[PDB]
Amino acid sequence: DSLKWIVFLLFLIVLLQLAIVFLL
Amino acid sequence: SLKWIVFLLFLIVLLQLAIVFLLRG
Amino acid sequence: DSLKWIVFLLFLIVLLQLAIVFLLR
Amino acid sequence: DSLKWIVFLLFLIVLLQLAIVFLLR
Amino acid sequence: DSLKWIVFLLFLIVLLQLAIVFLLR
Numbered sequence: 001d002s003l004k005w006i007v008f009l010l011f012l013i014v015l016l017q018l019a020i021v022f023l024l
Numbered sequence: 025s026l027k028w029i030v031f032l033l034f035l036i037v038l039l040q041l042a043i044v045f046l047l048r049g
Numbered sequence: 050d051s052l053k054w055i056v057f058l059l060f061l062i063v064l065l066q067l068a069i070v071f072l073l074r
Numbered sequence: 075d076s077l078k079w080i081v082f083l084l085f086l087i088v089l090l091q092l093a094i095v096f097l098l099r
Numbered sequence: 100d101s102l103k104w105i106v107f108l109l110f111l112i113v114l115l116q117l118a119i120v121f122l123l124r
Contacts, residue, residue, distance in 0.1 A: 003105070007101055007104045007105060017115035
């Protein structure tokens with residue numbers, strides 16, 4: 001459903017923010 | 025409304041990937 | 050309606066991500 | 075409820091994005 | 100419930116934005 005995709009996309013955004021902190 | 029939220033989150037993910045790519049180089 | 054506010058805020062976030070990408074480029 | 079807390083967190087995210095843009099500029 | 104996970108992930112995103120701002124300044 002849509003809520004599961006929202007949760008997964010937020011998890012991906014968290015991972016991408018982690019990658020941004022490492023590169024900074 | 026949920027479809028719009030999913031689409032906007034997907035766009036945000038794409039933009040975050042672009043930001044990561046720009047930060048790499 | 051909270052869903053409309055959520056969608057509008059996500060759209061604003063998309064625009065701000067575009068601004069950040071432009072600044073990084 | 076959860077929706078209002080989500081709206082508040084998204085508003086905080088927008089504020090932090092604006093701060094990031096200001097720091098980059 | 101998925102709403103609790105959404106709220107927690109938004110909180111994590113807020114924390115990571117705070118960390119990004121701290122690193123930028």
